[PDB]
Amino acid sequence: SLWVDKYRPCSLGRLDYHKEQAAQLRNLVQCGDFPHLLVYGPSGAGKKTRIMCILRELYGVGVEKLRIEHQTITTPSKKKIEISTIASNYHLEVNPSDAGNSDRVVIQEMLKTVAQSQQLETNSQRDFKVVLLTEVDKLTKDAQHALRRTMEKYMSTCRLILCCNSTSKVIPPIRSRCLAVRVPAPSIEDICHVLSTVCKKEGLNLPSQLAHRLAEKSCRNLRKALLMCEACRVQQYPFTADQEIPETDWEVYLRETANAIVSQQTPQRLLEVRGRLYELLTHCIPPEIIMKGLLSELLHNCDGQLKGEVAQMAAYYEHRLQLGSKAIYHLEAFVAKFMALYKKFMED
Amino acid sequence: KIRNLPWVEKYRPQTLNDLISHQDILSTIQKFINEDRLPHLLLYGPPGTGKTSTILACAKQLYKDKEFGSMVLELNASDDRGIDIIRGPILSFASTRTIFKKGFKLVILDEADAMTQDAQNALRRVIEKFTENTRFCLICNYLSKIIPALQSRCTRFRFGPLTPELMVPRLEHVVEEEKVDISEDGMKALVTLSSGDMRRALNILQSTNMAFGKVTEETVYTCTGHPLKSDIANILDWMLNQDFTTAYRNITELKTLKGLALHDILTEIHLFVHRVDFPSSVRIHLLTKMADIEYRLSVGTNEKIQLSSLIAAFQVTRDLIVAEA
Amino acid sequence: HYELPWVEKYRPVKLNEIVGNEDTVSRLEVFAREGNVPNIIIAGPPGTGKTTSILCLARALLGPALKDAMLELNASNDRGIDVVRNKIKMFAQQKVTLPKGRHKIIILDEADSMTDGAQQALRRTMEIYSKTTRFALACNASDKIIEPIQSRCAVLRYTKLTDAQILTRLMNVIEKERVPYTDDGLEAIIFTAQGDMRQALNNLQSTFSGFGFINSENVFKVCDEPHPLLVKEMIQHCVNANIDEAYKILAHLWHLGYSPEDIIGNIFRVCKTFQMAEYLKLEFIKEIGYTHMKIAEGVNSLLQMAGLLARLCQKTMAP
Amino acid sequence: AKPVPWVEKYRPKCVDEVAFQEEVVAVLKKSLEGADLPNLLFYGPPGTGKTSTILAAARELFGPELFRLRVLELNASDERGIQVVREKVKNFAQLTVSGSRSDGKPCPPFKIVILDEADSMTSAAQAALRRTMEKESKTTRFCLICNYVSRIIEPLTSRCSKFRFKPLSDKIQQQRLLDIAKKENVKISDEGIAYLVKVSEGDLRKAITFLQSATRLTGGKEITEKVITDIAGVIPAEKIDGVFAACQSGSFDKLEAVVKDLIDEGHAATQLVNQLHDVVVENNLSDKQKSIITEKLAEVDKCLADGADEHLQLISLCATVMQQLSQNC
Amino acid sequence: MFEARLVQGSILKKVLEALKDLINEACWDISSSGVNLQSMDSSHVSLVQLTLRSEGFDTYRCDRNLAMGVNLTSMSKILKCAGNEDIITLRAEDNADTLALVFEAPNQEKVSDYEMKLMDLDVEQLGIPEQEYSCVVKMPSGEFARICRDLSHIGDAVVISCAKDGVKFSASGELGNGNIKLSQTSNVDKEEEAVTIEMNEPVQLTFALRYLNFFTKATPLSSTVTLSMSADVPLVVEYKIADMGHLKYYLAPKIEDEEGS
Amino acid sequence: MFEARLVQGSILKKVLEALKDLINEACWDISSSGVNLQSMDSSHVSLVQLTLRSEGFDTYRCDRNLAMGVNLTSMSKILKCAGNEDIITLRAEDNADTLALVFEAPNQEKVSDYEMKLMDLDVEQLGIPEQEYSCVVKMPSGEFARICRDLSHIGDAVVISCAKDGVKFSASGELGNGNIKLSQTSNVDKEEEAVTIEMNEPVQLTFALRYLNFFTKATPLSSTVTLSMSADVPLVVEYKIADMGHLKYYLAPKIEDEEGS
DNA sequence: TTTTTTTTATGTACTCGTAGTGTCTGC
DNA sequence: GCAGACACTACGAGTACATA
Ligand SMILES: Nc1ncnc2c1ncn2[C@@H]1O[C@H](COP(=O)(O)OP(=O)(O)OP(O)(O)=S)[C@@H](O)[C@H]1O
Ligand SMILES: Nc1ncnc2c1ncn2[C@@H]1O[C@H](COP(=O)(O)OP(=O)(O)OP(O)(O)=S)[C@@H](O)[C@H]1O
Ligand SMILES: Nc1ncnc2c1ncn2[C@@H]1O[C@H](COP(=O)(O)OP(=O)(O)OP(O)(O)=S)[C@@H](O)[C@H]1O
Ligand SMILES: Nc1ncnc2c1ncn2[C@@H]1O[C@H](COP(=O)(O)OP(=O)(O)O)[C@@H](O)[C@H]1O
Ligand SMILES: [Mg+2]
Ligand SMILES: [Mg+2]
Ligand SMILES: [Mg+2]
């Protein structure tokens, strides 16, 4: 077991950061009439930890005994699609985005069977069940429009805890039905305290400067920070102040792709950059993270009266990417527009 | 006897004389019926103009009640109208005779725009081959969804929008038979908000009679929720006369007090822009901007930001109009 | 007995009564006189007389052997993969005695609705039994008929009818029907027809039945002016960045009751064949498609069409 | 004796409990008296009361014993294709009205078809509904519920009497929230309820959810303004002043820094767009600057409505207002 | 209150298996005289009249007249699970919509209550002319069903001609002509097999084959079917049930055009 | 090492098309007393027990207790090429991972062997409690095939009750309910039609329609069908396959939905 | 002088394989 | 009288495409 899973807190009182929010969530779910929840924030903030702490507070300690459940759903086109599901003796977790555009079928058939069934044991298990819809920001609009009446009819029997990164992708019919719970990212000091507590629980010594550099390099992601802390323990046991932190391959590949964009502005360089973007897309990297990393690196080499136009260009082509279906067209259009703007800026 | 029906179905023109607007088309159709030479009809136009009621009056005039089931095969979009139906029941109805009394049959195809291209292509020789025994009437709203062969086979009558001059006496008859108190401005508001559609005029009249009991301009514009012409003129005056914060405060106060929606405001402002003698570039910019705002309101957007953009589209061109001189 | 409409009562029964495409109709008349006609595909606009020419040629070639040596199939029939294998093929092998120069005629009207596999199965029965049988196909869009079928025939193509060609048959129908008329009303009938003889006969019968006299305002009371002739002038007004006249024509077409889908479709058809620059036409077509996306998703008002007109005027002033 | 959350516990059971939708409530009340109920179309912002009004109405007209035999409710949560409209809706509309109420209350001679969330219905499936309402209106009625009337086709719009559900006013929402707080043995200050009706923006479901969640968070004590501010996700004013200071600085590095601060603190971009627009329409900027900043705010809010990325839209809007603030410098 | 009772259930089975692929919905017209059913098919070409006498029922009571629209696709799945030597009960209240179809199993122990839901399709009453027919022919139903099946092999529409000598069946099909002429075959031991001619005027009409074979599914109902024909009024295939009533059929002729030549 | 010989080839042509659509694997457990098959679905709703004793085989040689798993997709295509009244022999070695299946004629020079890959599946025995139920009744097999097909035209979930009068089969839907109560048919010539009730506590439960209809194509395997069920114990359907063994079925109750406004 | 593959979400149409099933033949 | 063989229609399944 890695450090991200071995030292996860179990109850709401064990969380080191956002303790006031932990007390508020403790007071929220005590009576049992709490509404649907929309736990949202940046990735790696601790949203799933707080959701499982809420599930630990509501039911017994039986919410940690999980199992893999498989269900085959019939599409309107009569093509069978298998979907995986984490389930417990008290709650169930669904990721409908694994079905692709058939998530509406998952909402219409899989969720109604859970919501329309009252719980078998009423004394050990409570008066309601909890369904965890994870990554509802990747849900299509048809699935979100199929979701809303299930959250209104069987609410007093089937409760929902929706988890997402951005609430802009959630339709306001869903956003009106659920209480939004904001989980911000922990700051540098909270990540340093968590890393120091993890290293002290393992019998190690962690300097403050190395923990600070691990916190800044993770970009306020506690999962990523604990992973590079474990990797830095693995590669070199003496924790020096200037110890090299390992990096993921797709981020440095994106950095080299943007360096190749800056280095030459020609159609065959555009073809090579398109090949690099095909390599990035085939490794299941999402295209909006490709656009974000591209804007993160290409703005370092831009001059001060060019960064706003590049930012507006990136946002415009990202919106056209989310409107369309093929990522390579909008990605290569953004790259070609940046090369045209860079050539016009440098030649004048 | 009294019946529980909506007023758009309780008051239906069962005869051709009860329809109001298309007098020349209905005179030609009555001369087709009286001379026993009714051809294949293609009744097209905007909704609510009386295309279904015209062919229902024609079928009621042509055939009696004791033989209506043997002569009219009425199929609409609620029934399945595939190529199996065209090669099956429709072809067998067209190619056979009548059980009770000798005469020509009628196949009414309501919502013929919703039919597939395969069924429309299979319908051509059924129309052409058996034109002596039966006649086909196609009723559609979009003529582009009907193949040009079917448009060639059937003579077309454009049932255009109902002008408010001839639309008044039918509403007066409905008012007199429904015992409704109505003023002149109430009838003007009905024939203005209906916009060539007698169905929503009767719906507005029934909803205003249920909501208030009286039909006045205030009651109609309150039940419908439409803004009045004076308030649209005031909104245009605020957007063209004052600065951003004062015009924003005035329009937001009016929208909060009246409970207005931005779609009707955009529609009436778009109507008032073409009347106002704008320059060509200013009119082009304004039309593009209001098209962008009205497109933007079709999704889960905030209406306050779109109202600020609607003010912004005129605050941009105020300086251009003034410096044009 | 019930009197037929003038479209089907005044169908030509001989090949000399068919007007328009004089060389093709004359060659069909020569074939009908002599015999040994080849396989024939007639393509053209609706109402030109392809079915009339095929049926007149078959009636003149066969004559009294019509009921046993002619197989007529339409889109109202099946014409699947089984009908070609068991019905066209069995009739092709079927022995019918005939005079010299005369063959069995298999008439396949509206061959666009024929599937690709059925037309593939139609090839070898067409080539093998050509000593005994012949084929006569009629179609509107010739691209739906596959290339091996078109190689097996003399693909005749019909053009849209000239106004004088419609006018001669209008004289014919008027003098057998005793219709009072004026010249301007008949020009209005021709203008409403637009190369369609079915529409000419339908509008003439409607004007004669409704009013009894053919002047211009009697025609235009029940018929309508054609829609893309105004759309051409409004697109021309959009070319010179004149938004006022373009909106005047757009509002006139809006108050006539035309749906936004029909208006934008005729806008696209006019802009397809309009005479301007190629790049300007391409960005016009892109703008038309971008507006048609908004029409298709649900928002369709006069404001969207005016915004499309303003964007088309913006495309000229933005080099 | 299980607990029930307040949005369903205070769901209107009758027509008189619906708030501020005066015209349509009067229409259904005259239909309760026995008048000719037409085909209804309900559209408006979320949380305004479109579903609850027709459900309380159908409970009033039919009672408990006739709800299953006279009301067919279809939403987007079940399948509504062309075949469901052609078979299930048409067979229900062709049924007979039989069975009267046993409590002596009058029974209407029609059925009610509730097509909730009719935006998700296809244009082909909506076209099959037209002559179903035109032919079978003697024995059944149709009520389409939607949020955007542009997604409803013009024949179905023309067939149904349209009632627009307005956003709730501040006064009526204030009295309704005060009555709910009085019925639940809880207390809230004047500033707290004023901030609640300011945050909710005419959404009564959101207001009831926030009031219930503040009651559960505080435990039963005074519901002040600060628990409302930290329960609504409202961005503090210091972050907005820092954003405008970074915009007036004219450098993109501090702009990225404050945009990354706002993204990393979990603040939604819709709330930032709302608060940013509230600041821009109430300061001493020029009319042209306010105009194109508000146009950029509208296009950024639209781009967030199709689910684009938060960070890129925020950096584009902040770059545009940075350029506008540094143009006059 | 309406409580009819079929003495054997095989009579109802053979009726509704003949209208299973033919008629759209069962519109039962109920009176004190008996149960009536006058509904056209889906294509508005054929017409079915069914009259069952009250004297053939076990017990029959009808306080007030009802119009009883019942969907038949859902109805025909209940006579599959019905015995032939068994008891069929039909119930309908005054102002309800349930239709109790109570019977027993082939195992012959249990009551089996099945419910229908009534429909509200208003239908204008189609006036049967009741005019004299210029060709009345008595003929067995088994022989009428056999030569309708043989004629479906050859053609699509059959030319049916009647005269003084007898009926004549002609099918101008794809493979050629199939002509069957039958007459005066009453010189047999059985009384059901008989061809008799009653009227004089000779007619000729063409009918669709897909409805003539549909009408001959009532072969177990009657041993002998009466064929009524004339020039204007349509063809009648008349089944007379022995102790229940009669089943009346109509089929419009097809449109034919002579060659101009 | 496992080698067995069957008396008839129609036993596997009647037992193995029944589980064509229930279970995704065929796990045969070898013991000295006989073979055992205990498998579940992917939905964990139906359990099937198949136990064939060793005394009825033509030959039976067993040395060790193993566990082999056979797939369904290749198996179902094989049995259509097999005969009906022939003998079916099987072969499986100790170290080989390929089960041999032979469906040769009873008098033939050569054999036909269509072997398949043994699937290495890791499953456990849940363990039936074999407790005392609330009602145990005997029913005909062919009649149970008709009444499971009977309710398939009404709804998607059926209700089976079993009181002292008889076993009540109900199917409530949008069309109409249907009630069937088998009782007291001991006065018949055959011993197959004797419907008896043995116990007494009445239990009402709801079971899914599809899994009972997936069972009733194996009805000519046995003569009678024994039905056992309790309040919380799953419904047990018992088959007795001639003299070679017995078959047991298990259905958990179908989950009943809520009632609203 | 250069050729692989399943995604888009319904609605409809075409084509083909398969399975109960009514009916006929024979000892 | 009951087992085997024949063609019959209903139903399940795979595939293509939808514009001028
Ligand atoms: N010309 C008219 N004269 C009088 N009443 C009319 C007229 N047109 C419409 N109405 C009224 O509006 C109702 C609906 O008219 P319809 O004939 O159904 O409209 P429509 O032409 O069928 O439009 P669509 O395309 O089918 S929605 C009628 O029952 C009348 O009450
Ligand atoms: N060239 C023509 N000369 C005289 N009458 C014509 C001519 N073309 C058409 N007509 C008339 O129009 C009627 C229909 O003509 P058709 O031959 O059916 O048109 P078409 O060429 O077949 O077009 P489509 O593809 O079938 S819609 C005929 O019956 C004539 O009355
Ligand atoms: N006008 C109102 N009067 C009283 N309570 C209301 C009102 N509107 C909303 N509510 C409350 O808010 C809850 C939700 O109301 P709904 O009727 O479901 O909103 P809605 O109109 O359906 O919004 P959408 O479009 O479905 S997201 C109800 O159960 C009530 O508790
Ligand atoms: N309060 C906490 N104390 C210690 N570790 C935490 C805490 N919150 C989160 N973590 C760790 O940080 C990671 C965050 O991941 P997760 O909890 O799934 O949130 P998210 O869903 O936002 O990634 C987890 O692996 C968890 O082990
Ligand atoms: Mg209509
Ligand atoms: Mg033609
Ligand atoms: Mg709702």
Side-chain angles (χ1 to χ4, degrees), chain A residues 3-5 7-9 15-17 42-50 194 222-223 226:
Chain A
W3 277 358
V4 280
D5 291 331
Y7 290 113
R8 217 196 58 173
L15 309 173
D16 318 89
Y17 59 95
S43 44
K47 309 188 289 285
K48 193 53 149 316
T49 313
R50 267 136 198 84
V194 164
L222 196 50
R223 203 208 332 266
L226 284 153

Side-chain angles (χ1 to χ4, degrees), chain B residues 5-161:
Chain B
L5 271 167
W7 291 8
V8 313
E9 279 121 22
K10 187 193 290 268
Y11 300 105
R12 180 173 283 272
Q14 306 251 309
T15 47
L16 285 184
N17 318 308
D18 301 15
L19 303 124
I20 39 185
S21 186
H22 333 93
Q23 270 324 106
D24 296 314
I25 296 176
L26 285 184
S27 306
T28 311
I29 288 172
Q30 192 70 261
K31 285 161 182 179
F32 275 139
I33 291 177
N34 287 338
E35 267 128 30
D36 304 0
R37 50 168 53 239
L38 178 80
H40 308 289
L41 302 180
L42 180 51
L43 264 46
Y44 72 103
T49 53
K51 308 182 291 295
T52 306
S53 305
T54 286
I55 208 55
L56 283 188
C58 289
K60 264 185 56 63
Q61 189 174 342
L62 272 164
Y63 319 119
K64 311 155 190 175
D65 43 340
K66 300 186 182 181
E67 51 164 342
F68 199 85
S70 316
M71 284 298 207
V72 177
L73 180 63
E74 205 271 340
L75 288 183
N76 35 73
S78 71
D79 322 83
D80 157 79
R81 279 186 309 185
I83 208 168
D84 196 2
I85 313 295
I86 311 286
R87 295 204 236 99
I90 282 192
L91 184 55
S92 61
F93 183 80
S95 51
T96 44
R97 273 221 285 189
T98 319
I99 291 186
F100 304 128
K101 303 158 190 176
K102 300 182 61 181
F104 84 104
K105 316 227 247 182
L106 185 68
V107 194
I108 304 176
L109 293 164
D110 270 30
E111 296 104 55
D113 36 45
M115 267 194 315
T116 60
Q117 290 208 353
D118 324 285
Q120 285 184 27
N121 271 281
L123 251 186
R124 294 155 60 162
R125 293 299 292 164
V126 190
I127 287 175
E128 258 197 333
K129 203 183 154 223
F130 308 108
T131 181
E132 193 232 337
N133 185 35
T134 168
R135 311 293 152 81
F136 282 78
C137 180
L138 327 168
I139 290 166
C140 72
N141 289 125
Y142 327 103
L143 209 60
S144 55
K145 282 218 222 314
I146 294 194
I147 58 168
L150 282 195
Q151 295 180 30
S152 292
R153 267 154 181 82
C154 307
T155 166
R156 53 189 93 152
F157 292 121
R158 189 196 93 251
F159 269 58

Side-chain angles (χ1 to χ4, degrees), chain F residues 104-123:
Chain F
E104 81 157 283
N107 213 6
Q108 200 153 53
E109 307 173 56
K110 208 42 190 176
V111 313
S112 201
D113 170 86
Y114 282 177
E115 64 269 59
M116 80 300 295
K117 185 43 171 63
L118 276 187
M119 281 215 308
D120 213 274
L121 201 54
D122 198 289
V123 292

Side-chain angles (χ1 to χ4, degrees), chain C residues 235-255:
Chain C
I235 287 302
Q236 179 57 252
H237 284 315
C238 279
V239 155
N240 316 121
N242 214 1
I243 193 64
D244 315 278
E245 274 96 335
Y247 182 74
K248 275 175 48 81
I249 302 172
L250 170 74
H252 173 68
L253 295 174
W254 189 269
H255 303 334

Side-chain angles (χ1 to χ4, degrees), chain D residues 15 22 30 32 41 44 49 55 57 70 86 97 103 112 114 117 121 138 143 146 167 204 233 286 288 292-293 308 319:
Chain D
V15 187
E22 273 107 21
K30 302 263 192 314
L32 254 50
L41 177 48
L55 257 70
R70 305 279 201 96
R86 273 215 215 100
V97 294
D103 39 10
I112 297 187
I114 306 174
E117 308 146 15
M121 228 168 310
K138 183 63 201 214
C143 183
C146 59
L204 202 40
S286 72
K288 180 182 180 183
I292 48 193
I293 283 164

Side-chain angles (χ1 to χ4, degrees), chain D residues 143-184:
Chain D
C143 183
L144 329 168
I145 303 175
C146 59
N147 273 128
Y148 325 95
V149 70
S150 59
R151 319 267 300 270
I152 299 294
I153 53 165
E154 325 109 295
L156 277 205
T157 278
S158 185
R159 279 166 168 79
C160 276
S161 73
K162 301 139 58 59
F163 292 110
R164 196 187 107 255
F165 274 68
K166 309 159 160 34
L168 299 187
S169 46
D170 295 16
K171 170 183 56 214
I172 288 266
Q173 223 183 344
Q174 170 141 350
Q175 319 283 280
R176 180 59 54 130
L177 283 176
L178 271 163
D179 272 49
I180 290 168
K182 174 82 171 313
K183 281 192 268 157
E184 282 292 324

